[PDB]
Design a binder for this molecule. Structure first.
Ligand SMILES: [Mg+2]
Ligand SMILES: [Mg+2]
Ligand SMILES: [Mg+2]
Ligand SMILES: [Mg+2]
Ligand SMILES: [Mg+2]
Ligand SMILES: [Mg+2]
Ligand SMILES: [Mg+2]
Ligand SMILES: [Mg+2]
Lengths: 95, 48, 37
């Protein structure tokens, strides 16, 4: 199956919550630039025609691969709705 | 354009209905948070 | 043709945001800036 799906399930209060997180994270990963990640250096996402997955194959396969680590934060109301998209555009280039 | 697909507009099934319904005396009007209008037929129903 | 009331379309999760500790300090810096003069 998929990497630590259990481990994931366990990090959320509701199953259907995990799905929204991953999806919204996948969203931002592409919109604001795909380098909006927290774990790129040593052991990261990879595909084999070359090791080129490092740039843009699957959005959420990343999202999940980050959420499985303890860097991200998903809350009910963590950061005010509109100020989030502003601070994100300011700090992440690639367009 | 490699754009993450957009968020759905109203289905024509719905609109086809509302009007079919309108064709008969009944008036079906969608409503807001507070009971107020909202618009399915994007801009084609207001007159002239 | 509206989103389903049940499922991921749950009032309990329809709203949930995500963060990077990098964007966490970035918003609090926005709060720091609120201090006038
Ligand atoms: Mg790495
Ligand atoms: Mg994480
Ligand atoms: Mg709210
Ligand atoms: Mg920009
Ligand atoms: Mg609709
Ligand atoms: Mg009515
Ligand atoms: Mg009133
Ligand atoms: Mg939302």
């Amino acid at each position: 199956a998929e990497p630590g799906i259990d481990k994931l399930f366990g990090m959320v209060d509701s199953k259907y919550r995990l799905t929204v997180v991953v999806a919204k994270r996948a969203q931002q990963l592409l919109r604001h630039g795909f380098k909006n990640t927290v774990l790129e250096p040593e052991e990261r996402p990879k595909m084999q025609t070359l090791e080129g997955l490092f740039d843009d194959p699957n959005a959420e396969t990343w999202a999940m691969k980050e959420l499985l680590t303890g860097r991200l934060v998903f809350g009910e109301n963590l950061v005010p709705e509109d100020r989030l998209q502003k601070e994100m555009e300011r700090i992440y280039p690639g367009e | 354009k490699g754009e993450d697909v957009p968020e759905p507009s109203v289905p024509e099934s719905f609109r086809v209905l509302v009007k079919e319904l309108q064709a008969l005396a009944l008036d079906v009007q969608t409503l807001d948070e507070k009971d107020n209008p909202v618009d399915i037929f994007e801009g084609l129903a207001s007159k002239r | 043709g509206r989103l389903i009331p049940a499922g991921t379309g749950s009032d309990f999760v329809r709203f949930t945001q995500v963060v990077d500790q990098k964007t966490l300090k970035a918003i609090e810096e926005a709060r720091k800036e609120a201090v006038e003069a």
